[PDB]
Ligand binder design. Sequence first.
Ligand SMILES: Nc1ncnc2c1ncn2[C@@H]1O[C@H](CO)[C@@H](O)[C@H]1O
Length: 259
Amino acid sequence: KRQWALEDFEIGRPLGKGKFGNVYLAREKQSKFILALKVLFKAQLEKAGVEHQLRREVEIQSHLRHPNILRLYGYFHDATRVYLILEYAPLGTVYRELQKLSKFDEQRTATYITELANALSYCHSKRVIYRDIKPENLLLGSAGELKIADFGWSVHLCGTLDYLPPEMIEGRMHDEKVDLWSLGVLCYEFLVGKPPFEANTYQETYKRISRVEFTFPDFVTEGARDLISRLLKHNPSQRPMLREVLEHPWITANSSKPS
Ligand SMILES: Nc1ncnc2c1ncn2[C@@H]1O[C@H](CO)[C@@H](O)[C@H]1O
């Protein structure tokens, strides 16, 4: 845990683009360590109340260590900018992989779900609840293992509703179960190629989520449908435990990874 400066890193190609900031491949000069460096201008941040939100997000991230959670090594700032030192994921985002492939097979989906659940169980133990997870925020390691990247929204709406649970959008207070819903949405999107509540309109998506209106294409197997339906209950209480998800026969049948 030391203070870092831009002089310390050689900066490479951009890994990703974002309005808040851009992510660059970087190499630490002393160790030749390869990593992603995330650059945020203070001003863009200050304009919105993120400045407190970013500091808590950084605080939460630094402490967490899991195979399926993207590591944050450190942070530093320059007169006009904030820089996040992040683990680098060679195989990139699941999002890019999904739009390259268009859908995932059950074996790849089940494996991703299992890794997600494991990562989620670990977060809950630390009293960290995630709330926002989407293929854009999922990264792949050299082994091809899923990693949870952001945490920029972590706790113990003008933005997209696609992955938000009914309780959060309706203004009801929310608990861990919120993550179980996220798992159900992701599992659907992996298999089908689109999130279950996708719509032309924020207002339209609101209603679909609120009513929990989703249908399955023919190719989705009964095993998957059962898992999704359990995950996607309107009442958080009905939603299964992570352990229950890990033990689901469909997960068990098709997963590479352990519970
Ligand atoms: N460590 C990283 N390795 C690879 N791509 C990353 C990394 N951090 C962020 N990104 C990319 O930048 C985007 C913005 O966070 C991500 O969705 C992803 O595409």
